[PDB]
From Swiss-Prot, chains A, C:
Molecular chaperone; assists the folding of proteins upon ATP hydrolysis. Known to play a role, in vitro, in the folding of actin and tubulin. In yeast may play a role in mitotic spindle formation. It is found in: Cytoplasm. This is T-complex protein 1 subunit zeta. GO terms for cellular component: chaperonin-containing T-complex. Pfam families: Cpn60_TCP1. Coiled coil: none annotated. Keywords: Acetylation, ATP-binding, Chaperone, Cytoplasm, Nucleotide-binding, Phosphoprotein. GO terms for biological process: chaperone mediated protein folding independent of cofactor; protein folding. Belongs to the TCP-1 chaperonin family. Heterooligomeric complex of about 850 to 900 kDa that forms two stacked rings, 12 to 16 nm in diameter. SUPFAM superfamilies: GroEL apical domain-like, GroEL equatorial domain-like, GroEL-intermediate domain like.
Swiss-Prot record, chain B:
GO terms for cellular component: chaperonin-containing T-complex; cytoplasm. Heterooligomeric complex of about 850 to 900 kDa that forms two stacked rings, 12 to 16 nm in diameter. It comes from Saccharomyces cerevisiae (strain ATCC 204508 / S288c) (Baker's yeast). This is T-complex protein 1 subunit theta. CDD domains: TCP1_theta. Molecular chaperone; assists the folding of proteins upon ATP hydrolysis. Known to play a role, in vitro, in the folding of actin and tubulin. In yeast may play a role in mitotic spindle formation. The keyword tRNA-binding does not apply. There is a cross-link at residue 9 (Glycyl lysine isopeptide (Lys-Gly) (interchain with G-Cter in ubiquitin)).
Length: 534, 543, 534
């Protein structure tokens, strides 16, 4: 049963390849899990080395011919768009679930019964999912609990020293953008900017917006406190005639007169701008005037604006002009003829942080900015790439906490309890089927991979901690009270995940159990592999 | 670099059941099965066997082939020892047990590829074998009354000669049945004392003539010459015969008696001494009334000369196996010493003469209606010694076939030439539908495995296989107004030699196989077939 | 770390090879396990074929290069020296116990905890062994139950058609040599002799002793209903003078006088033998006289003994002459001069079965024979070897029932119950250790190999038949009663092993659990595999 230029793997031989295909992808990603995970290198082929612990960036940068890992990577990409966290968690659940299933495949169990046992246990897992979850209050004074959610998304990908740096940055970034009510939150209002020349531990949060081009003149004020803002669209630099012409000077001084006469049209608008500062808080302290003007400005106007102590910006990004319009409040002024003091906005202290090569102007201390900025600092591109992965996944982690009022404790508390749940429930219930008991038991034993590999990457004996946690759960059930138990990676014993502050999102775990079950199910449904047309 | 799994033993070769050795074992047996498919039947083929001693022989019988072949592979050795099990207890069915047990494994492969467990395959044949052995008891048509008539022997011996030597069937039937009737005594309602020994019928063959000149005599026939000057005795009945174990010569002393020579005077006395003593010994022996001396040992020169003057026929028989059967005829007993032919030790024979057979003269030993003989001899004549030797093998199997008729229900018979085979297939399918469970798959394949025998006879005869098969089914499948299906069960596989069409009735040519041979062949072949399926692995190790 | 001519397997890969090598032997010998198993064939290379399903008989005839299977072959050798049956079962218990431990070995569990968990479970197995065992009455009227023990022993080694033949033979063999009033029995009293040229279904039981050499003469009696037996050491044939002499005869009649004068010494003893028959019960009906005389007998005495209708035996084995002292009871007569009617013994029907090649003499129907004989019939050599292996294993299996009063139900009743017991006991007890739970659970799951193998050779679904038994055990446990459950191999459902008549010996299962645990533990205790001279 063959034709030329074809390959076929049939009669359970495809199952041994597909399960091994999952064991190969699992062992690679088994190294990095939780805060004890590992760092990997990704070569794009252009010579740029990128170090990241995020499974989202890993699966996209690597090319795998194995079709089993392709479906895992494609399904994890859907999980990365929905959950945004726990990419490795999904892979570890799929691989181990196929390993426990492959042992029953060698026993002669049909894969449909194995997949049916996973779907029945998944429906019972969703019932325990709603029972085990903890309902968190909607109060926005919960920052203490947000400090626990932050450490969950931070400690994983960082040395834990950048955690204390990024903890006040991420937590203040979400609550500043989020108004107090139930409405929504916008992650686009938080800008992510990267800079060099300074250590990553000095990364700071920017309440306002950050920009590159500053006022160029030695005498311009560096620090201006509580100044009015002007958004100006008109070019203050030298202009030329729209039609071809020339300047013919009879005398040497006439050459400067013709140049001053052409700039007089721009100088006429320049006089109307400086009269606005003389009209409003010219000599008044704690008040100033700033020119964010979008188009270019010649050095002659920069010298005039410096004598007035006016900060003058030129060649500003078009997107930032609309963003600074909402942050500062001042409307965009196309023509100076319509310039009025009521159009001017208001901002707080504007101070230029000037390194050797570059100058940084800060818009911060705004009345109603409604836009934040996270400025990522690093000496090399390694710290800039690793921090950007922690910021993007850190903001989306807290974002799912305000959108979903339900939260679940982490540290394997959900996986160990549910595995013990299906073990004791299926024996008491016995309402599924006799042959389904294999699929249910394999699914319950496969979910132990996360708490086993989490402490395995920590170095502690997994058999010891899983025994102490199981004994503590049995002692908790004998005392007849609710006790949440989780693994402690630093000490190696058990602990309380609610006290330790380790929490897992509800939407992440809801799509992880349902997603990993659907991934491994479709892989067991493949009896034969076929390669044709090649 | 490439490892190897499954063999931890001393670099040997052991096929696991996962590798399908049972399918491979059947394939190796299928090579031997095809050898017997061209053997069974009167249209079968003969195989030339070149011995390692530089002797070229040709024979139809497969049991002789298996003895000339060196069998090693374990799956084949089971049927070879099963063939020897068919060789004992009966003289027919050598090609039956080989083809039957070979096809039982052929149809077993279709069940193995289906996934049916080999144990459930063996269990299916064991239940179907008991259904067949019980049905064959009711499928009997006639029964031999053991009347021992010549015509009754012609009915049994005629089909036995077929499938071995064809065209001589009717000619050899009158020769074999005549010699058997001579050994068979006249008795009825006595089953306590067994009779009809195979060695009681001797077969000798001389080149020349044809089968038309072959005759049957009552007595033993010896190829040795009449050493004495008397060629033949008279026509007077009841001549006395003395069987001597001691050679014919001067008697010795039971204690020592070693001849020594010292001086020439003793040598002259040794010649005259042996001259007077032997003349005195042969005298007194001939004076006792014995006219024929059979010497189991050598005969001296002077001892032979004195018996020639007294008219004593001297015939030497060095073979002790022929002297034992000579005692059952003449009645004489061998004497270890010489010189005392006691008349109670003497026998009686009517005629001892020398006849010319095929151009050579041989001294025979025979009788006419007196001093009854338990041993007979068939004298065969033919131009080709090769084919004439194969005639002797067909007669010996015909004598063993008559030995198949005894007290253990041997007289029961069944129609042969595929007549019982096709009928038994429809009767087993009747058991299949009535037996619920997974056995239906094994019972039906058990009946299909019996299609090899009728297809074999049609294939070797040049007939069209596609035409003969439905003619066999349509003949045994009829609609009758009742439970018993009546007139004609006799439709067989027709070996024509003629032109036109169709099958024939067994009653026409009276060609059938006895129930004793067919019932024993099926039980051994099925047990041998279920045995091969019992071995899923073989292991060889140093003894 | 190496010197010339050395090979060493050091790390955990060494133990993986020893287990895998043991897993290879398991797959080979698991096919012949149970009555539904397969019959293996052996070839010594010289053309000898042997068909046996016994584990040791196979292992002793095969040469194994694998060092792990050699220890199993040595362990199976000690099992037959003690239990005599179940050598294959021990192999199936050792291999699967290593496979179940191999799963935990890959988890990083040290083999000491694995071996210590097996010893703790072995101690609990012995505690369950005393509670689960059944005490059988010592009464010898239990033959109905012995018919069930015979089937348990026979159905394994035969096609089950020879079972009905060998069941009355083996059962009558043990009880006939079994002494009354709870004494012991001697298996040596039952003689096993093989013969050719008859079908195996014709195998019959011989209550007395059978002799090879029979009386040669056409007039010898076929059967004698009752006869007086004579055991004689005196030669009845032609003899010679004790001192050197010679016979010189002038005529042929004088030679007969010298020959009769020398035989007159034997004839004088011959007249005393024939007159002793008329001395005691000469004219009495249902009386006879038989000559078993050891030395040769000339045909002249055979003709005289035939006229008196006396059976005359000659050339008898010296060992068989001593057996007739126990079977018949007649004393050995060294000299006819001292011959007396008090020396002769009495016997029942003596009938000579006449086959062309072989003549048989039956000493049977004796008052106190105290010796049996089992005559095994077969056409080929392998048919005699398979039946002899079934008789030798059948006689010892029934002998262990009378010696050991304790009985256990078969059909996996001890294996399935103990596997369910130890799993539920360790959870309720919890008195071993937390890490030992792996070794205890691995042993309980390793006990399922036998009931899964019995249905594997039968072809039935092992998962379906196991769930039906677990449902019956749970229903019997909830009903609060004692119900023994076993797997029915013919039908495929469960069964009561007490009603179906499938019984296993107590000594077999006692040394199997202890033996398989000690050998499998020693294999796990191997740290390094050293090879010298290879």
């Amino acid at each position: 049963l063959l034709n030329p230029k074809a390959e076929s793997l049939r009669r359970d031989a495809a199952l041994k390849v597909n399960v091994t295909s999952a064991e190969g992808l699992q062992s690679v990603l088994e190294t990095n899990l939780g805060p004890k995970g590992t760092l990997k290198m990704l070569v794009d082929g252009a010579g740029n080395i990128k170090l990241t612990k995020d499974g989202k960036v890993l699966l996209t940068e690597m090319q795998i011919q194995s079709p089993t890992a392709v479906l895992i990577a494609r399904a994890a990409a859907a999980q990365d768009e929905i959950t945004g966290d726990g990419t490795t968690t999904v892979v570890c659940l799929v691989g181990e679930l196929l390993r426990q299933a492959h042992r029953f495949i060698q026993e002669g169990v049909h894969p449909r019964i194995i997949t049916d046992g996973f779907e029945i246990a998944r429906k019972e897992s969703m019932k325990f999912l709603d029972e085990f979850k903890i309902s968190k209050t909607n109060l926005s004074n919960d920052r203490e609990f947000l400090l626990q959610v932050a450490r969950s998304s931070l400690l994983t990908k960082v040395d834990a020293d950048l955690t204390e740096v990024l903890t006040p940055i991420v937590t203040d970034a979400v609550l500043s953008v989020y108004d107090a009510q139930a409405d929504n939150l916008d992650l686009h209002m938080v800008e992510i900017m990267q800079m060099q020349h300074l250590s990553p531990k000095d990364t700071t949060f920017i309440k306002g917006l950050v920009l590159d081009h500053g006022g160029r003149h030695p005498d311009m004020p560096t620090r201006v406190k509580n100044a009015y803002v002007l958004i100006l669209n008109v070019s203050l630099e030298y202009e030329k005639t729209e039609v071809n012409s020339g300047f013919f000077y009879s005398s040497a001084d006439q050459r400067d007169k013709l140049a001053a006469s052409e700039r007089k049209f721009v100088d006429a608008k320049l006089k109307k701008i400086i009269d606005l500062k003389n009209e409003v808080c010219g000599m008044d302290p704690d008040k100033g005037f700033v020119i964010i003007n979008q188009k270019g400005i010649d050095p002659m106007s920069l010298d005039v604006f410096a004598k007035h102590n006016i900060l003058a910006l030129r060649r500003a990004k078009r997107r930032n002009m609309e963003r600074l319009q909402l942050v500062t409040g001042g409307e965009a002024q196309n023509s100076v003829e319509d310039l009025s003091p009521q159009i001017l906005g208001f901002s707080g202290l504007v101070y230029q942080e000037t390194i050797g090569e570059e100058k940084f102007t800060y818009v911060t201390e705004n009345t109603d900015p409604k836009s934040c900025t996270i400025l990522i600092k690093g000496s090399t591109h390694y710290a800039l790439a690793q921090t950007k992965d922690a910021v993007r996944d850190g903001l989306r982690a807290v974002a799912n906490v305000l959108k979903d009022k339900n939260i679940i404790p982490g540290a394997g508390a959900f996986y160990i309890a549910l595995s013990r749940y299906l073990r004791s429930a299926n024996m008491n219930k016995l309402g599924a089927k006799g042959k389904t008991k294999t699929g249910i038991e394999a699914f319950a034993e496969a979910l132990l991979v996360i708490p086993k590999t989490l402490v395995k990457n920590s170095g502690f004996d997994p058999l010891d901690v899983l025994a102490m946690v199981e004994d503590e759960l049995d002692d908790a059930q004998d005392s007849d009270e609710t006790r949440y138990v989780g693994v402690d990676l630093n000490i190696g014993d058990s602990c309380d995940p609610t006290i330790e502050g380790i929490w897992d999102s509800y939407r992440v775990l809801r799509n992880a159990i349902t997603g990993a079950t659907g991934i491994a199910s479709n892989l067991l449904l493949c009896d034969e592999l076929l390669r044709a047309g090649r | 670099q490439n490892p190897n799994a499954g063999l931890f033993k001393q670099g040997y070769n052991s096929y696991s059941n996962a590798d399908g050795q049972i399918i491979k074992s059947i394939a190796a047996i299928r090579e031997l099965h095809q050898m017997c498919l061209t053997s069974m039947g009167p249209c079968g083929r003969n195989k030339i066997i070149v011995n390692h001693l530089g002797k070229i022989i040709i024979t139809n019988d497969a049991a002789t082939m298996l003895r000339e072949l060196d069998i090693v592979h374990p799956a084949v050795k089971v049927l070879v020892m099963a063939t020897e099990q068919q060789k004992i207890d009966m003289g027919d069915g050598t090609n039956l047990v080989m083809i039957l047990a070979g096809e039982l494994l052929n149809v077993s492969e279709k069940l193995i590829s289906m996934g049916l467990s080999a144990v459930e395959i063996i269990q299916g044949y064991n239940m179907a074998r008991k259904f067949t052995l019980k049905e064959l008891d009711e499928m009997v048509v006639g029964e031999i009354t053991d009347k021992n008539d010549k015509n009754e022997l012609l009915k049994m011996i005629k089909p036995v000669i077929s499938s071995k030597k064809y065209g001589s069937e009717d000619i050899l039937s009158e020769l074999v049945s005549e010699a058997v009737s001579h050994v068979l005594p006249v008795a009825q309602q006595a089953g306590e004392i067994p009779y009809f020994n195979v060695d009681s019928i001797r077969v000798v063959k001389i080149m020349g003539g044809s089968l038309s000149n072959s005759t049957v005599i009552k007595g033993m026939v010896f190829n040795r010459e009449p050493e004495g000057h008397v060629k033949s005795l008279s026509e007077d009945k009841k001549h006395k015969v003395a069987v001597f174990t001691c050679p014919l010569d001067i008697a010795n002393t039971e204690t020592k008696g070693t001849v020594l020579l010292h001086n020439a005077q003793e040598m002259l006395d040794f010649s005259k001494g042996e001259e007077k003593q032997i003349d005195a010994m042969m005298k007194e022996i001939a004076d006792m009334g014995v006219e024929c001396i059979v010497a189991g040992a050598g005969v001296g020169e002077l001892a032979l000369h004195y018996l020639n003057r007294y008219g004593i026929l001297v015939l030497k028989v060095p073979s002790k196996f022929e002297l034992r059967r000579l005692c059952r005829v003449c009645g004489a007993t061998p004497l270890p010493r010489l010189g005392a032919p006691t008349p109670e030790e003497l026998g009686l024979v009517e005629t001892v003469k020398t006849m010319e057979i095929g151009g050579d003269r041989v001294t025979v030993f025979k009788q006419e209606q007196g001093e009854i003989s338990r041993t007979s001899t068939i004298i065969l004549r033919g131009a080709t010694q090769n084919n004439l030797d194969d005639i002797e093998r067909a007669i010996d199997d015909g004598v063993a076939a008559v030995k198949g008729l005894m007290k253990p229900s041997g007289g029961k018979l069944l129609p042969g030439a595929g007549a019982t085979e096709i009928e038994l297939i429809s009767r087993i399918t009747k058991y299949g539908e009535r037996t619920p469970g997974l056995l239906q798959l094994a019972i039906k394949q058990f009946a299909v495995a019996f299609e090899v025998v009728p297809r074999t006879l049609a294939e070797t005869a040049g007939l069209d296989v596609n035409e003969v098969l439905p003619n066999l089914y349509a003949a045994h499948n009829v609609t009758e107004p009742g439970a018993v299906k009546t007139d004609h069960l006799y439709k067989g596989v027709d070996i024509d030699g003629e032109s036109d069409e169709g099958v024939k009735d067994i009653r026409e040519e009276n060609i059938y196989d006895m129930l004793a041979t067919k019932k024993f062949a099926i039980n051994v072949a099925t047990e041998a077939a279920t045995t091969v399926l019992s071995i899923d692995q073989i292991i060889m190790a140093k003894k």
